[PDB]
Amino acid sequence: VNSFSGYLKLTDNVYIKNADIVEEAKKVKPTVVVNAANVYLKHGGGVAGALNKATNNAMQVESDDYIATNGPLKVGGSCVLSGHNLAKHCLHVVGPNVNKGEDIQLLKSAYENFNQHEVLLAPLLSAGIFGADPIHSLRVCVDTVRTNVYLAVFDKNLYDKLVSSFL
């Protein structure tokens, strides 16, 4: 039993809800919130820009130190950093950004990072400003993640189409 509430169940292990991931994380304070990161951990917009804003830029400060030490992530890769006031940990996951010409096949590799965590709050990887089809992203999520994932979809109109088209 967990404190995730109001989710529609899609599979044994995948759940979904129309919700602002920022407001969800503050309410639940999950063990892991997933960020839709880029390789530079520059949290300028999208889910990443919103989460960082909610941390009063502490996420960005921590991220800049991480990059200065370790260099950029790989597309499809991840790192675990602090969750600040939103969660215990933030799993920064880099899905391919179609608006940069990045290979969409790397989306499966990106979702594989979720399997290292028993329970996560997460957005659809490569959706929104990363330019991929959110329906496809949901399919890859369901077919790749085996741990318990609570997907937050910000757009109510997008949320309804995702549910209404799920096979």
Ligand SMILES: Cc1c[nH]c2ncnc(NCC3(O)CCCC3)c12
């Ligand atoms: C930008 C943002 C703020 N809070 C959020 N919570 C969950 N998802 C998000 N953006 C990913 C989308 O696919 C959902 C609708 C268009 C992009 C956000």
Ligand SMILES: [Cl-]
């Ligand atoms: Cl977005």
